[model samples]
Target: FLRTDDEVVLQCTATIHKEQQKLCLAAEGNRLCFLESTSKNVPPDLSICTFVLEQSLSVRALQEMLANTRTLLYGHAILLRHSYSGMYLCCLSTSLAFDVGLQEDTTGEACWWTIHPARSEGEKVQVGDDLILVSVSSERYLHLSYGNSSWHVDAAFQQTLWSVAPI
Candidate 1:
């Protein structure tokens, strides 16, 4: 089992690679995809050698992770990849006014988020819980609304629920 707040290596689980290559988010376009290095002399693009892990952080925790004073905090962090775009999932904004997108820099506060897990009768998260990505700074959760192409952070919608797994 994976522990929240621990850093771990990530790979694209998308089927296109057949053999999962190194997973990295593109810095320029904020796209996530797999990467491979064919030669020792030349290196792959910015999407290569990116590392990520699931974590939960608060303003204090964010300060610890970033070594700075950023006010944004999320309960959990995890990386997900898209099969079609081959990009890694990312939180694009620290403010609720913006939408989330595939991002490359996992260390950025904008990329970090709180993941809600299934709760028990006591409203406490159990050992095994359903995953829902939420914003730490606001009550909004990530959603795929109106059949839009990109993901947005909005009020809890039935479509906002997600299942997160370690790969």
Candidate 2:
């Protein structure tokens, strides 16, 4: 019942680092793991993390599901990885955007993103709910500033939401 072309499977904890580290957002091959293990018997394709939700309410488009196509997780730009170590997610500045890692996929623009609804700023999103991926040009928020590290849209006090289900 949470439409907009649904096609979901995401787990993005970090609300207080999930009380220490029950982390989420897995995916090790093309790399984008926010700490990993919350394993309920893992391997449903490396805990998926796929997303699509964009039926566009004028400007809401969170498409990432890289390997089988559906990119556009746009905000600032870089998220390249088309293969092992093809790298991209590099936040670029503000101390490397708080040192969020990954970088080697060129044609630069920094890991763009804009998937919204972390509450207030023009809300109206649902389909398992809870989502926030900012930095459509910088100011960041792809967060996960604690457990197992390496994920940062950059700022907004560490809260990276992300619950949306349905695999």
Candidate 3:
């Protein structure tokens, strides 16, 4: 079961990249490393790359979690912190979306990314769900373009989507 504050992996849907190439951080947000191929194509190392979701939970959602419910609903704000380096995935163009690394708390609401479901599949974020992560500050989608470490995005017909998977 997934919930706010859970550790998870974010896999971008596009790129010259493969399925196993998750949104990972090397040193903060500067670079993302690819998994070195081994036997089963070497999946991402969870200990090194997963991130924890810290979100602003509503009273109802908070109560549900207290009763052992761990579902992440859409429309809540979340901040992703790289579990290994303790660096936050703070965005920077303010593509026109930037990748910024922050250890200290962000200056504004820049670190916040609101979850918007790709379709009307009910609220709580479920595994294998396609997601559109909208920046809370700019309301712009955090679209990912793989390879060469480049990201250029527009919220149009291209489908700026990212898939959510359990780590």
Candidate 4:
């Protein structure tokens, strides 16, 4: 199963309806970057396209959670903490509609994400399992809208599917 703190690559899973170009979500220059066709076969080998999954705890309100809990579960909240800059991947659907970034730390909501598998199998999420990441705040599906290779959170009108690969 894809457990938290597991260094992984968010390899893109493309659908024919839209851009079928191969790519993976990555952190570069302290921002998100999309790179071409990585080692999509198995057992991840990508180096720089890595992220550390961390529990999203800090919020607009004070809350207490676990101490380095494991296994990413469906319907649970988490953060795609940038491996390089240590910033949480953030997004907004309004004001900065469809924009994604890595410009937040110690805040909540914008950096909080709820992992949802496209095919619900069990409570625990595993690697290579297709998933749809939605913003915990507005519930906008995180997908590649393909403008300059940048990502956006929209109402789920995109590939919307991603698989977690090894680092």
Question: Which candidate number maximizes TM-score?
Answer: 4
Candidate 4 clashing pairs? none
User: Which regions of candidate 3 are displaced past 4 Å?
Assistant: 15-46, 58-69, 93-95, 119-122, 146-159
lDDT of 2 by residue, 1-167 (tens): 44444554556644453454334453343333334545462433542334444333223222332322432222212232323233444455545335444555533335544566553444444555677665544656667654344432334445577665644
What TM-score against the true fold does each predicted structure earn? 0.43, 0.25, 0.64, 0.71
49-72, model 4: which lDDT tens digit per residue?
A: 677887633222223432222777
Q: Write the per-residue lDDT of candidate 3 for residues 112-138, one digit (tens) a residue.
A: 667777754337777777777776556
Ranking of predictions according to TM-score: 4, 3, 1, 2
Superposed model 2: Cα runs more than 4 Å off? 1-4, 12-37, 41-52, 56-133, 147-166
Q: What does candidate 3 score on TM?
A: 0.64
Ranking by lDDT: 4, 3, 2, 1
Evaluation by TM-score, superior candidate among 2 and 3:
3
lDDT of 2 at 138: 60
- Model 4 root mean square deviation, Cα atoms: 5.3
Considering every candidate listed, which one attains the maximal lDDT?
4
Candidate 2 weakest ten by summed lDDT: 71-80
lDDT of residue 94 for candidate 2: 49
Cα deviation of 92 in candidate 2 (Å)?
21
Q: What does candidate 2 score in Cα RMSD to the true structure?
A: 15.8
Residue-pair clashes per prediction, in order, are 5, 14, 2, 0
lDDT of each: 0.40, 0.45, 0.56, 0.62
